[PDB]
Amino acid sequence: MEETRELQSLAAAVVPSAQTLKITDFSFSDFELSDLETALCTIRMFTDLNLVQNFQMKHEVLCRWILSVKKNYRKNVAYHNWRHAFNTAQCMFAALKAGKIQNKLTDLEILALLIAALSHDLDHRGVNNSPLAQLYCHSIMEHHHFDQCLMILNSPGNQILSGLSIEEYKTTLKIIKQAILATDLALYIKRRGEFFELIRKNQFNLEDPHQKELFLAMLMTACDLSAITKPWPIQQRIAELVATEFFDKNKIPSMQVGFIDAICLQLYEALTHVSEDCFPLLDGCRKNRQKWQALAE
Numbered sequence: 001m002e003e004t005r006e007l008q009s010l011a012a013a014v015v016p017s018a019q020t021l022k023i024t025d026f027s028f029s030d031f032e033l034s035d036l037e038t039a040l041c042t043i044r045m046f047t048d049l050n051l052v053q054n055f056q057m058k059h060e061v062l063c064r065w066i067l068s069v070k071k072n073y074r075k076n077v078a079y080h081n082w083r084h085a086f087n088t089a090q091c092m093f094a095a096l097k098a099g100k101i102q103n104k105l106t107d108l109e110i111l112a113l114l115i116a117a118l119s120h121d122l123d124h125r126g127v128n129n130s131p132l133a134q135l136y137c138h139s140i141m142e143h144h145h146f147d148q149c150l151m152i153l154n155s156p157g158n159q160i161l162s163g164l165s166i167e168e169y170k171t172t173l174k175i176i177k178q179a180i181l182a183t184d185l186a187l188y189i190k191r192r193g194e195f196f197e198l199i200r201k202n203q204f205n206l207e208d209p210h211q212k213e214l215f216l217a218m219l220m221t222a223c224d225l226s227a228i229t230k231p232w233p234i235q236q237r238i239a240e241l242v243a244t245e246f247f248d249k250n251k252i253p254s255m256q257v258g259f260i261d262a263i264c265l266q267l268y269e270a271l272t273h274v275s276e277d278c279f280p281l282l283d284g285c286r287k288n289r290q291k292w293q294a295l296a297e
Ligand SMILES: CCCOc1ccc(S(=O)(=O)N2CCN(C)CC2)cc1-c1nc2c(c(=O)[nH]1)CCC2
Pocket: 185, 224, 225, 226, 227, 228, 238, 239, 240, 242, 243, 246, 252, 255, 256, 258, 259, 262, 263
């Protein structure tokens, strides 16, 4: 089979260092990478976050899990596909390392963010595709993604959480679930005020469980949207993909400016306040606003 073949190549490979793979960079890009290569980067992300060790993940199982995740994104979807999930994970990784967020969180939280970033759009069909009620929003889409995530975590050969104790397992699933549900922009809009207001007053505090949970949610949105922060030539390219999905052009630049003002700037400003080293995200986002604004006329 084409697929057990893919599993063999992947399990046999030597995983280059994080530095060699450029996965520590906020300006990372996946355009020139093969599927196999994105899988290796992903293993390096688990490894250098020290998650394979702390939680005793078997190599064959992690490899199989990554391939399952990859397999359950649809390639025919121009933007909401595996590369988007892979990029969201890479940005999470870079915020934890380069952005120095790692030290602010527990191992279990880090574990759950990485998994959530990779799984958060599982089985997406495209924004233009959409039982009972369904009456009041409620993140139906994200519930589906999380269910997909859960089913893969429980598939034979795919159980990367088997090394956790039952109590750790339950805590981790809860975090994964909240994390995936947090990628619903509506929820993000609903909750950001609290977070901004708190940073305003220099009252923000990670020791408060309520605030921790709020921060993790903000963190997910920041990664989920991070394409908006990439170097111009790359951002233009990703914008291309999004437009293809949204519509299957003269108004696109102003749309981009609207999106950056409405959603992105404040979030990346807030994240910078929490950790100054996440500044490149904010900086990259500002430069892109300037560029799209110039096209907008
Ligand atoms: C480039 C084509 C047009 O792109 C957009 C147009 C509108 C918006 S939006 O007004 O903030 N918005 C549209 C309605 N959604 C449910 C939420 C997002 C975002 C985007 C948009 N979203 C994303 C990116 C982007 O470049 N544009 C990259 C990360 C996600």
